[PDB]
């Protein structure tokens, strides 16, 4: 029968660590850096770009438009590279879940575990806090408590929306398994189709909220 997301684990420094999540996030990272080397070797300028270059440049200028609309690029240029990895590292991190492995499968996405999204969201938090302190050291003072929550609810909602939006898939891939295999394919098909849309939209909103939260941090 169905069970919640348990893990295989190993102890590396007194603390136990999940064997997958760390495996599938490494599989995502190596493919990302493999595309980075392959593009950097293939890179064009006077000649016509190939598929990987016209893809990654479309993402970099989409991020450039967003960051330069939000803040002057003279002030905060580093939020662009930080934003495109947050898009593409997360994008691949969801896409690999489309290929069939199950029989219980280890190959759940990196965001189907809360630790991954907590590390990313907490990193984004300390980064934008360092951005705020770097510029010097809301829109109404009397809202301090909400502006108090904002600093918790930004990383907590970032992590929780990324977790929930992907953890549901990690459950539904098991749910349709309970139906007869000779009829289970069609709902499995539809859901696999929708998986890409939610994975992409989720990577998109996390990157955009990262930019827009950074914009709000480094104000004045």
């Amino acid at each position: 029968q169905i069970e919640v997301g348990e893990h295989h684990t190993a102890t590396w420094l007194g603390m136990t660590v999940n064997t997958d999540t760390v495996l599938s996030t490494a599989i995502a990272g190596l493919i990302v850096i493999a595309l980075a080397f392959y593009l950097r070797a293939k890179v064009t300028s006077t000649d016509v770009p190939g598929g990987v270059q016209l893809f990654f440049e479309a993402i970099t200028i989409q991020m450039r438009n967003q960051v330069e609309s939000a803040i002057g690029m003279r002030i905060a240029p580093f939020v662009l590279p930080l934003a495109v990895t947050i898009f593409v590292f997360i994008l691949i991190s969801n896409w690999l879940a489309v290929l069939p492995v199950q029989y219980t499968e280890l190959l759940k996405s990196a965001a189907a575990d809360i630790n991954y999204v907590l590390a990313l969201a907490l990193f984004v938090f300390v980064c934008y806090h360092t951005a705020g302190i770097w510029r010097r050291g809301g829109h109404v003072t009397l809202l301090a408590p909400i502006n108090l929550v904002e600093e918790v609810a930004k990383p907590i909602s970032l992590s929780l929306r990324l977790f929930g939006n992907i953890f549901a898939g990690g459950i539904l891939v098991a749910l349709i398994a309970l139906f007869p295999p000779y009829i289970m394919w069609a709902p499995n098909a539809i859901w696999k189709a929708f998986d890409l849309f939610v994975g992409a939209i989720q990577a998109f909103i996390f990157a955009l909220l990262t930019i827009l939260y950074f914009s709000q941090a480094m104000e004045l």
Binding site: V4, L160, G164, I171, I201, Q202, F204
Partner: protein, 81 residues
């Protein structure tokens, strides 16, 4: 005995998925109602209207799929016994 907690887990998990579907479904309506109308006002604005649409959906659907996560914590992994 356990069966009263397990009945409470099914009723209480059911509420989390009921309020989820109402909030998301209506949200992606009131947001989509502003997209379609936009693409009816300037039939060539669609391209950019996806940038604020998928932002609003990403905020709305979050309130549903965070509910769905916690519903699995209610239904399969009941924090109380």
């Amino acid at each position: 005995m356990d069966p009263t907690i397990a009945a409470g887990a099914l009723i209480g998990g059911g509420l989390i998925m009921a309020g989820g579907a109402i909030g998301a479904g209506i949200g992606d309506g009131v947001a989509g109602n502003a997209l379609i109308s936009g693409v009816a006002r300037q039939p060539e604005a669609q391209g950019r209207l996806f940038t604020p649409f998928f932002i609003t959906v990403g905020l709305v659907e979050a309130a549903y799929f965070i509910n769905l996560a916690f519903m699995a914590l209610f239904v399969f992994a009941t924090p109380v016994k």
